[PDB]
Design a binder for this molecule. Structure first.
Ligand SMILES: *[C@@H]1O[C@H](CO)[C@@H](O[C@@H]2O[C@H](CO)[C@@H](O[C@@H]3O[C@H](CO)[C@@H](O)[C@H](O[C@H]4O[C@H](CO)[C@@H](O)[C@H](O)[C@@H]4O)[C@@H]3O)[C@H](O)[C@H]2NC(C)=O)[C@H](O)[C@H]1NC(C)=O
Ligand SMILES: *[C@@H]1O[C@H](CO)[C@@H](O)[C@H](O)[C@H]1NC(C)=O
Ligand SMILES: *[C@@H]1O[C@H](CO)[C@@H](O)[C@H](O)[C@H]1NC(C)=O
Ligand SMILES: *[C@@H]1O[C@H](CO)[C@@H](O)[C@H](O)[C@H]1NC(C)=O
Ligand SMILES: *[C@@H]1O[C@H](CO)[C@@H](O)[C@H](O)[C@H]1NC(C)=O
Ligand SMILES: *[C@@H]1O[C@H](CO)[C@@H](O)[C@H](O)[C@H]1NC(C)=O
Ligand SMILES: *[C@@H]1O[C@H](CO)[C@@H](O)[C@H](O)[C@H]1NC(C)=O
Ligand SMILES: *[C@@H]1O[C@H](CO)[C@@H](O)[C@H](O)[C@H]1NC(C)=O
Lengths: 247, 273
């Protein structure tokens, strides 16, 4: 019975069962064409290879810390006086994916085109796919390189690279991007710009003495001298804009 | 290039497998496919035909007595040093001399027909079958030989020969092909002889099987009897109508007829004065 093809993970311990027949039967384990065990003798010099004998009829090959070098065909030749028995087993060792490179957390200004890279390795070859943290988005196409042309304000956030395999796939690392945009006043003041701007309240000729995204002026005990048309100046390192309002 | 050497032995011979090693070899063994034959001095195989010859720390050699076709396979010598394992592999190839096992029976066909001749031989390695024409030099490298619109000159013995390149002889065999054709009258002679002198009529029609020639004097046919003083001599390709001395009744028209299983023919000749 047992198995013809056995799949295990890298670093795990694999157990290749080979129950033999009753009598004075002698068993031998073979890596490819070479002898690993011949009855009680251990021909192999590897410390990871051993025999697990559950009972007198049992004869198994146990490889601890199995590696990619260990994958291949293993043959257990049970020797019966009548006819010899053979139970070959193909061992396949899997390497879980490992994202070994990803773009650093960058902050690039708006309007430019940027390319994000995510490289991974494993056995078998992993497939790299992208996604956006923001809920209003569509999963990008499976590609190690993700290129966005003319990035907008809403496209910033974390981009979650996922390198997947058919088995033991989880390999997720994120990179946050911040797009810088020249601030624009939407209502008067009230605006939105990144990096956060220092709103300047300029009434007429000069400004005289504040939420991060809004600026609130104070108007109590109004005087006739105070009346006039004032302007809201919001300036940042990227841009500056002004908007007037009468009072 | 690949560590799979070919070691061919004749069937029934003894095959010795020598594995040469250095001094620092811990273990060593000879293996039939993936089954151990001898592990050092320990015999693993139950086959008495496998014997141990040399176990010197410099070479490990075994013997196989009465090598058979089943013994063909990849034989490996796996041995171990203190640091790394080793394998030297050998592929046992059994040779069987070539011999024809089936060949066509002597075939007969009518002229213009189609003939196929087969020559089946067994042997390892795969034997090369060759057809040959004994009368006219012709060779065809093929197990079967097909002759289209076979003619009179193509009939004869067709020899088949097969060899596997071994020292042993090719064991060739021959088959006879005989084509059949109806008679066609080729030559006809008439005699205008005077009274008192001998004369003869003849016809020439070749056929296979040989055509039965018939002679006709006017309406009647001749029976080769001493009555009327006539005698006909029939041959494989001819039939002479012989007239010794003369007779008044002998003068007149004559017709000969040559017929076999495939057709008939007739020609008219006269006897004049
Ligand atoms: C190397 O290993 C292979 C298999 O791993 C092994 O092949 C085996 O060979 C033996 C003979 O050498 C085969 O047994 C024969 O089977 C045929 C049917 O095909 C029988 O006709 C045979 O009967 C004869 O021999 C009997 C026992 O000697 C007699 O009792 C009998 O009257 C006949 O004389 C014979 O049983 C066997 O089938 C194969 N097995 C396989 C899987 O191919 C090969 O022999 C090994 N080589 C060496 C050198 O050990
Ligand atoms: C086991 O077999 C493989 C071939 O599949 C080979 O690469 C390896 O070296 C062998 N031995 C060990 C100890 O890994
Ligand atoms: C990427 O940006 C550069 C710089 O402005 C521009 O020249 C190029 O055309 C852009 N590529 C695409 C595909 O828009
Ligand atoms: C607004 O900014 C523009 C551009 O610098 C400038 O020309 C204009 O005078 C400004 N107006 C006010 C009211 O600040
Ligand atoms: C036998 O000879 C052939 C020649 O083509 C070679 O390719 C092969 O490796 C040799 N050994 C075998 C078949 O074991
Ligand atoms: C093979 O060896 C056996 C015993 O060693 C011997 O009897 C036999 O004659 C040998 N074969 C041939 C063909 O000589
Ligand atoms: C050989 O094969 C032919 C093919 O049909 C068959 O008729 C014949 O009986 C076989 N044996 C001989 C001896 O021709
Ligand atoms: C001989 O042949 C001629 C021409 O065919 C024919 O006219 C004649 O009758 C024949 N002779 C006899 C006796 O019939």
């Amino acid at each position: 019975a047992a198995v013809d093809n056995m799949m295990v993970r890298k670093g795990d311990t694999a157990v290749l069962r080979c129950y033999l027949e009753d009598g004075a039967s002698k068993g031998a384990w073979l890596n490819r064409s070479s002898i690993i065990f011949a009855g009680g003798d251990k021909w192999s010099v590897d410390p990871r290879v051993s025999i697990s004998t559950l009972n007198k009829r049992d004869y198994s090959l146990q490889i601890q810390n199995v590696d990619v070098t260990d994958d291949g065909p293993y043959t257990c030749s049970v020797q019966t006086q009548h006819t010899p028995r053979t139970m070959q087993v193909h061992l396949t060792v899997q390497v879980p994916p490992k994202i070994y490179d990803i773009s650093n957390d960058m902050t690039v200004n708006e309007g430019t085109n940027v390319t994000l890279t995510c490289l991974a390795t494993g056995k078998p070859e992993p497939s790299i796919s992208w996604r956006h943290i923001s809920p209003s988005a569509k999963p990008f196409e499976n590609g190690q390189y993700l290129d966005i042309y003319g990035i907008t304000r809403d496209q910033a956030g974390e981009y979650e690279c996922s390198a997947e395999n058919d088995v033991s796939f989880p390999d997720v690392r994120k990179v946050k991007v911040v797009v810088n945009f020249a601030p624009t006043i939407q209502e008067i003041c009230e605006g939105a710009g990144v990096p956060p701007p220092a709103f300047e309240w300029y009434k007429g000729e000069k400004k005289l003495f504040n939420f991060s995204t809004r600026s609130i002026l104070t108007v109590t005990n109004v005087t006739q001298e105070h009346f006039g048309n004032y302007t809201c100046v919001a300036a940042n390192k990227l841009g500056t804009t002004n908007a007037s309002l009468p009072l | 290039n690949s560590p799979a050497d070919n070691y061919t032995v004749c069937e029934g011979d003894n095959a010795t497998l020598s594995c040469f090693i250095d001094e620092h070899v811990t273990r060593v063994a000879w293996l039939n496919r993936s089954n151990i034959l001898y592990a050092g001095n320990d015999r693993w195989t139950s086959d008495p035909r496998v014997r141990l010859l040399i176990n010197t720390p410099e070479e490990f050699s075994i013997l196989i007595t009465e090598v058979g076709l089943g013994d063909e396979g990849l034989y490996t010598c796996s041995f171990q040093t203190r640091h790394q394992p080793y394998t030297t592999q050998v592929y046992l190839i059994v040779h069987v001399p070539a011999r024809i096992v089936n060949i066509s029976s002597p075939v007969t066909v009518n002229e213009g027909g189609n003939v196929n001749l087969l020559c089946l031989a067994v042997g390892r390695p795969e034997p090369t079958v060759t057809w040959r024409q004994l009368r006219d030099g012709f060779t065809s490298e093929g197990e079967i030989l097909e002759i289209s619109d076979i003619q009179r000159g193509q009939a004869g013995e067709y020899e088949c020969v097969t060899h596997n390149g071994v020292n042993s002889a090719p064991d060739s065999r021959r088959v006879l092909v005989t084509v059949n054709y109806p008679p066609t009258i080729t030559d006809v002679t008439s005699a205008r002889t005077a009274l008192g002198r001998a004369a003869l009529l003849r016809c020439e029609a070749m056929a296979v099987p040989p055509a039965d020639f018939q002679w006709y004097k006017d309406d009647r046919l001749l029976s080769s009897g001493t009555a009327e003083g006539l005698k006909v001599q029939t041959e494989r390709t001819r039939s002479m109508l012989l007239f010794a001395n003369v007779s008044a009744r002998h003068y007149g028209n004559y017709t000969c007829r040559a017929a076999n299983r495939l057709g008939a023919s007739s020609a008219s000749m006269r006897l004049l004065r």
